[PDB]
């Protein structure tokens, strides 16, 4: 047998992946189902996954001239911009006048 969509293989067992916003705390078995847990308030995981640790949210230092363009959710990281100010690097880790 081969695995269906949104599944992963572990010791010839097709387990369900974890939905976004949730990390893995237990692989499935022939008879139980994969055990996921929600990310933390400041944590996120954006894909169907079998990660064991969520990712931390981008922080937007106002010292570095940053405003929060979209707040962090559990399945999306924060999105940040500059505000008046104009961004230096293309990835936009910091801004300037």
């Amino acid at each position, epitope marked *: 047998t081969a695995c269906r969509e949104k599944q992963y293989l572990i010791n010839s067992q097709c387990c369900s992946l974890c939905q976004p916003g949730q990390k893995l705390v237990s692989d499935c078995t022939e008879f139980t189902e994969t055990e996921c847990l929600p990310c*933390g*308030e*400041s944590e996120f995981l954006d894909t169907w996954n079998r990660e064991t640790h969520c990712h931390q*949210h981008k*922080y937007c230092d106002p010292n570095l001239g940053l405003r929060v363009q*979209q707040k962090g959710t*559990s*399945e*999306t990281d924060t999105i940040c911009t500059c505000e008046g100010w104009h961004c230096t690097s293309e990835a936009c880790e910091s801004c300037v006048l």
Partner: antibody
Amino acid sequence: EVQLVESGGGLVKPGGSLRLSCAASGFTFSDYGMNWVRQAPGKGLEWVSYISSGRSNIYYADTVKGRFTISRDNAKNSLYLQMNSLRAEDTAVYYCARSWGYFDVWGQGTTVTVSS
Amino acid sequence: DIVMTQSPDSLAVSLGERATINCKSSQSLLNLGNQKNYLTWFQQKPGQPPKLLIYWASTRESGVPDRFSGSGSGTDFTLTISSLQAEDVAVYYCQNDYTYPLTFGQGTKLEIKR
């Protein structure tokens, strides 16, 4: 039950300072983001500041940038607002509100009056 | 800063009838990632803090009765209280939960006609 209990309000002279406290019970304080929100007598709600649950990231409303400072003591299950140089437009009821993507539990509020 | 503007400012509705409070935001509140609209409705009875009613524009908080209903998308949303009840008298606030600073609507005072 889940509880948030604000304290430390009162009467205060303009340009003077005041430190508010909020004592949490009934939930994993360390897990939630904590917020301060105020409501001036007669007016609507104003979100004042936020402090995250992870690496304790902090955001502020511009109208208190530079004057208020938010902090938490997870060991003590306490949230704090140190308010400095209070102008009289700061007179309001200050609400303690936990968040996990929305303010689902609020305190009863404490009153702060910035008066001559 | 996003600006939440509510309409009507004041509304009187008889018991049993349907109340309609509207909210418009200056930005969109759609998170294109999880496809959720980050609008939140609160009820504030007097002497009490606001009480969360509905988040993600349509998802009802636990314990909120089915007669409370959230609808809308993008920049225009609606809180519809059908089968209005004596204890529904409060001020209702919509709230930008999309980014910082988090901004509320200005209020809608609902009266009960009796």
